[PDB]
mmCIF file of C-alpha atoms and ligand atoms in Angstrom:
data_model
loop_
_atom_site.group_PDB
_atom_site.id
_atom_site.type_symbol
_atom_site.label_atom_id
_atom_site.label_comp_id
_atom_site.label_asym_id
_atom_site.label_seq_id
_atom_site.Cartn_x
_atom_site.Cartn_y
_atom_site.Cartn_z
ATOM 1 C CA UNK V 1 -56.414 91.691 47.605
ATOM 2 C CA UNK V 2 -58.092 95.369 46.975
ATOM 3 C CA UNK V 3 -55.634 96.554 49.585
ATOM 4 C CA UNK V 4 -52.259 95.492 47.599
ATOM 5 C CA UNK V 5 -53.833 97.294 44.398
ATOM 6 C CA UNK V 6 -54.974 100.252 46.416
ATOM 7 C CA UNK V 7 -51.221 100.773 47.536
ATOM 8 C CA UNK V 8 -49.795 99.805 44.081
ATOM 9 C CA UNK V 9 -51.991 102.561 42.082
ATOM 10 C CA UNK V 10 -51.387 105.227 44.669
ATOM 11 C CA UNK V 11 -47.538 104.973 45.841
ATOM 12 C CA UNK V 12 -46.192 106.799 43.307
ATOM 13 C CA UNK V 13 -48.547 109.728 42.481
ATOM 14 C CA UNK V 14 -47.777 112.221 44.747
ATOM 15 C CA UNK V 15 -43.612 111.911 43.688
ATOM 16 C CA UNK V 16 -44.933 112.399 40.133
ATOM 17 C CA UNK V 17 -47.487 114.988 40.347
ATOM 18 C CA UNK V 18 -44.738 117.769 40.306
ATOM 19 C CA UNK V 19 -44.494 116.926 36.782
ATOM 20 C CA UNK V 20 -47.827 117.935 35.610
ATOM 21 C CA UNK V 21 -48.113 121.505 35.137
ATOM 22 C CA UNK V 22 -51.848 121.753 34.732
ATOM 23 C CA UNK V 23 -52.249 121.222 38.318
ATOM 24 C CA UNK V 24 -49.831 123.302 39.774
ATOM 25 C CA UNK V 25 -53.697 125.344 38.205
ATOM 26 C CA UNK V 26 -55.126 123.805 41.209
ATOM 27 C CA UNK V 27 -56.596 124.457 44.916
ATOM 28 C CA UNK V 28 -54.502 122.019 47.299
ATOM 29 C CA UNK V 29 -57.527 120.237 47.973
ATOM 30 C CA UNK V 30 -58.682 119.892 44.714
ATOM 31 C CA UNK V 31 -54.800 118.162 43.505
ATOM 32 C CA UNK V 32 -54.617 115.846 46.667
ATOM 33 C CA UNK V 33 -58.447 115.117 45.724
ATOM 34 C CA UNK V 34 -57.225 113.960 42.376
ATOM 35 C CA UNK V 35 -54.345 112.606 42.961
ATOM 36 C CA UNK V 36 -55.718 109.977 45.462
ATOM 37 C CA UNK V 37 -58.080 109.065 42.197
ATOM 38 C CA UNK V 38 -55.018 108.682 39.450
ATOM 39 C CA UNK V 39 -53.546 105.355 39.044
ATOM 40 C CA UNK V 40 -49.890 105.386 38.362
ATOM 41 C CA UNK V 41 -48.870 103.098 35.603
ATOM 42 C CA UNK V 42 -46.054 102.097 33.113
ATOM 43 C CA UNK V 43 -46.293 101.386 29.839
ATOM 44 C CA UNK V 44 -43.288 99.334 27.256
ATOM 45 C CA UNK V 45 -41.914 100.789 24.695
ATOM 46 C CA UNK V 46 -44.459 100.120 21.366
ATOM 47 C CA UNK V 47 -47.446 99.271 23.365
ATOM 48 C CA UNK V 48 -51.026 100.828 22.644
ATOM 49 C CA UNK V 49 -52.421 102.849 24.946
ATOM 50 C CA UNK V 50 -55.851 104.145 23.267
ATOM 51 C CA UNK V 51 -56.857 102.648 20.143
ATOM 52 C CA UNK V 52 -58.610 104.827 17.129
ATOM 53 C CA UNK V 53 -62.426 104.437 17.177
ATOM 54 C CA UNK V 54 -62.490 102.160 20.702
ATOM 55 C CA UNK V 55 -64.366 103.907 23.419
ATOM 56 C CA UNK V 56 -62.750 105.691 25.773
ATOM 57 C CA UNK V 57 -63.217 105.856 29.625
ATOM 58 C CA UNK V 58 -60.683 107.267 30.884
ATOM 59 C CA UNK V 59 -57.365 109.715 29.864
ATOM 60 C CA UNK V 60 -53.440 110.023 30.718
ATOM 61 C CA UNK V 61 -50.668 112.659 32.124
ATOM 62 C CA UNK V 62 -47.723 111.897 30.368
ATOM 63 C CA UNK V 63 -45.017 111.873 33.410
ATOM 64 C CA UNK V 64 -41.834 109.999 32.170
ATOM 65 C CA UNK V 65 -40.874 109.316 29.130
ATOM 66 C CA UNK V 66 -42.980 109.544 25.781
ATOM 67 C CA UNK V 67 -46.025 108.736 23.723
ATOM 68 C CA UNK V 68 -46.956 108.605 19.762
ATOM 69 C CA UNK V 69 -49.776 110.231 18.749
ATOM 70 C CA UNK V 70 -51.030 108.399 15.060
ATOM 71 C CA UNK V 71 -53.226 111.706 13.173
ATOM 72 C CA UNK V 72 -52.606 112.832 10.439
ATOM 73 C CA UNK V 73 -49.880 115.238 11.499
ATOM 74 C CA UNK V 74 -48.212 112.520 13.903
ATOM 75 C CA UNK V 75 -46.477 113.763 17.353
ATOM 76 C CA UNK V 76 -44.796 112.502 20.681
ATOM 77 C CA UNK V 77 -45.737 113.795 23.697
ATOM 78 C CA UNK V 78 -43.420 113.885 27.040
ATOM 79 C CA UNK V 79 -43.570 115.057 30.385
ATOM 80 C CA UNK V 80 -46.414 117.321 31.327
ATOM 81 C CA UNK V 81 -49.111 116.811 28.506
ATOM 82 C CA UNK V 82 -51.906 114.804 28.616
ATOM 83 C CA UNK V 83 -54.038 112.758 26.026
ATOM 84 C CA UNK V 84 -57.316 110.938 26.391
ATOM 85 C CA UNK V 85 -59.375 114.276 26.983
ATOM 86 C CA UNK V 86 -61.067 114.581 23.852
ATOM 87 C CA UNK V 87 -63.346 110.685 23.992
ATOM 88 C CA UNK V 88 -64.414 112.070 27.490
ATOM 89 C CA UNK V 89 -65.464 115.399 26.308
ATOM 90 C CA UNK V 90 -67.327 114.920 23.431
ATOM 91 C CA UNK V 91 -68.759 111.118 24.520
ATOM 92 C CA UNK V 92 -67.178 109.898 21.085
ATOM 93 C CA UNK V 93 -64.872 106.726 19.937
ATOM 94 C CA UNK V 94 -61.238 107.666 20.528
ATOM 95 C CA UNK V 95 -59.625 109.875 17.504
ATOM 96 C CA UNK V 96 -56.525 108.424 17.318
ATOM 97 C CA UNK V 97 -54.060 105.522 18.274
ATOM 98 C CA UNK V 98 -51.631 106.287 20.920
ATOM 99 C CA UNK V 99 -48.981 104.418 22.079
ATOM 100 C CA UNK V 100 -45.757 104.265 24.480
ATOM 101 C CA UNK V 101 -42.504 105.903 22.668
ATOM 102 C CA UNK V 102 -39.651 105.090 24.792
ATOM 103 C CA UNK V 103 -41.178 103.277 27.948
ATOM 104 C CA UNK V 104 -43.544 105.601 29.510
ATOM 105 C CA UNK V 105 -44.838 106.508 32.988
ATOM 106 C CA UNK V 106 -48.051 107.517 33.195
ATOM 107 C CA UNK V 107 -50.950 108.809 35.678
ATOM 108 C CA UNK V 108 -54.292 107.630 34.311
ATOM 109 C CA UNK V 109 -57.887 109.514 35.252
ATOM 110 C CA UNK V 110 -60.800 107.807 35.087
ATOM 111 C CA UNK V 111 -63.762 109.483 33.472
ATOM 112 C CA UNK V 112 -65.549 110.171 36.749
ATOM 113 C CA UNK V 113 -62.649 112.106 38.173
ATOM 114 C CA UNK V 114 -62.136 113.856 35.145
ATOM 115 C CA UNK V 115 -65.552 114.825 35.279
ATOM 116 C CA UNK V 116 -65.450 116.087 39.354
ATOM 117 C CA UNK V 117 -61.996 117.724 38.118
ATOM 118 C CA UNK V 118 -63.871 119.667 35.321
ATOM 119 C CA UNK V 119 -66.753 120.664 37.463
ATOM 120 C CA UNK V 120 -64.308 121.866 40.049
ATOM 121 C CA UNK V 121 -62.341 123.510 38.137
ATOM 122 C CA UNK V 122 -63.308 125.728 35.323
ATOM 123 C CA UNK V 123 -60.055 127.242 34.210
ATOM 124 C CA UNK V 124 -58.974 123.104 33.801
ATOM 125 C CA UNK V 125 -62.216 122.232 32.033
ATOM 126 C CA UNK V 126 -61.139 125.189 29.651
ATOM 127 C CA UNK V 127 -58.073 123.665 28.983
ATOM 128 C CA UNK V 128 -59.032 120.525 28.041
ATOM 129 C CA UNK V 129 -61.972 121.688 25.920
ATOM 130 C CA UNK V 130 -59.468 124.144 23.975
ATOM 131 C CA UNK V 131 -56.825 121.496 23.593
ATOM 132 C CA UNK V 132 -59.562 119.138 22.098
ATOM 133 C CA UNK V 133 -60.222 121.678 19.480
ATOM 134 C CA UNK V 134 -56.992 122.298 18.804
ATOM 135 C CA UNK V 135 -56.284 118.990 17.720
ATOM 136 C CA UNK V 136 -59.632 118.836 16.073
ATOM 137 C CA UNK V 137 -57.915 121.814 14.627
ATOM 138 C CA UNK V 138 -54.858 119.752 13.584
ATOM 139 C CA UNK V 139 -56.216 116.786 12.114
ATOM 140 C CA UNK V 140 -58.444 119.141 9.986
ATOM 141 C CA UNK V 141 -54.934 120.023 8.178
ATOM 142 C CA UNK V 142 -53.358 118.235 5.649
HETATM 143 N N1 LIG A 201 -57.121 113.450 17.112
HETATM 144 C C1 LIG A 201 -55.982 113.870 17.691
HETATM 145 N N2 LIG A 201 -55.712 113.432 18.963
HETATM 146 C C2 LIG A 201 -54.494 113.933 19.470
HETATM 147 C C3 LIG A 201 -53.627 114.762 18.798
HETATM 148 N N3 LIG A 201 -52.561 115.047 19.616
HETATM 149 C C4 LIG A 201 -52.792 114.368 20.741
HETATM 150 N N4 LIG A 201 -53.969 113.663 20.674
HETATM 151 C C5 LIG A 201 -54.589 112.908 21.722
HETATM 152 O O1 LIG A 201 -54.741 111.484 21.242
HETATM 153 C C6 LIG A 201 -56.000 111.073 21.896
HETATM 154 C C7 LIG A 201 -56.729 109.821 21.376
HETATM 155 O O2 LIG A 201 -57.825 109.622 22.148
HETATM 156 P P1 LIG A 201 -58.848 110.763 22.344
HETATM 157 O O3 LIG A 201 -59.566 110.989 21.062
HETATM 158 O O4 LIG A 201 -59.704 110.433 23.550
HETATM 159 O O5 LIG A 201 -57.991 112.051 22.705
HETATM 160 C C8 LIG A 201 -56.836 112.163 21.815
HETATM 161 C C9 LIG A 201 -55.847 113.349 22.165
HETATM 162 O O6 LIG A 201 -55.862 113.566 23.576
HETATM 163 C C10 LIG A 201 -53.948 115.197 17.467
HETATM 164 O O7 LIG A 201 -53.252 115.966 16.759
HETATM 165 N N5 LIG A 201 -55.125 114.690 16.973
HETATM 166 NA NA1 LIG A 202 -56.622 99.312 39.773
#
């Protein structure tokens, strides 16, 4: 019932909060606010994530293990970043394909959270908005 998957998506997230150092940024009840929101999840090695040009509702802290990012300058992400950010910001499809590395823990954020995280949190929203363009930035590069 709700109550198993209300255990399941929480049990974990506190234990693997410490590993996200954007909210170490944050009032402590602000992160235990958020944290009771994430869903803890794990993802096999090769799976897609977020698929180029699908909409997006949601993004991911990268806690164990790593992701592939598919842009034109391709990277892997590990503990402590974060991808998803930019479909929630700017309302568009998703820019890019992203799947699991290596097996991958992750804590996902739905797009309502992310939105009471941004409004709460203006050095956080800052973050994500600058790390959007940056990788605006990126992909503008051959
Ligand atoms: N477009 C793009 N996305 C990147 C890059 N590096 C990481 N990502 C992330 O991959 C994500 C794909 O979905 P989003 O567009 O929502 O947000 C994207 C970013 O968070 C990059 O260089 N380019
Ligand atoms: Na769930």
């Amino acid at each position: 019932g709700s109550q198993e998957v209300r255990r399941g998506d929480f049990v974990r997230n506190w234990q693997l909060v410490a590993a996200v150092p954007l909210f170490q940024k944050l009032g402590p009840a602000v992160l235990v606010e958020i944290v009771r929101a994430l869903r803890a999840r794990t993802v096999p090695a090769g799976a897609v994530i977020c698929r180029i040009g699908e909409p997006g509702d949601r993004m991911f802290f990268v806690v164990e293990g790593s992701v592939s990012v598919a842009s034109p300058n391709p990277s892997e992400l590990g503990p402590g970043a974060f991808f998803g950010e930019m479909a929630l910001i700017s309302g568009e499809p998703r820019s890019a394909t992203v799947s699991a590395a290596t097996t991958v823990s992750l804590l996902s954020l739905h797009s309502a959270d992310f939105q009471m995280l941004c409004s709460s949190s203006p050095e956080i929203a800052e973050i994500f908005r600058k790390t959007a363009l940056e990788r605006r930035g990126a992909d503008a590069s051959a």
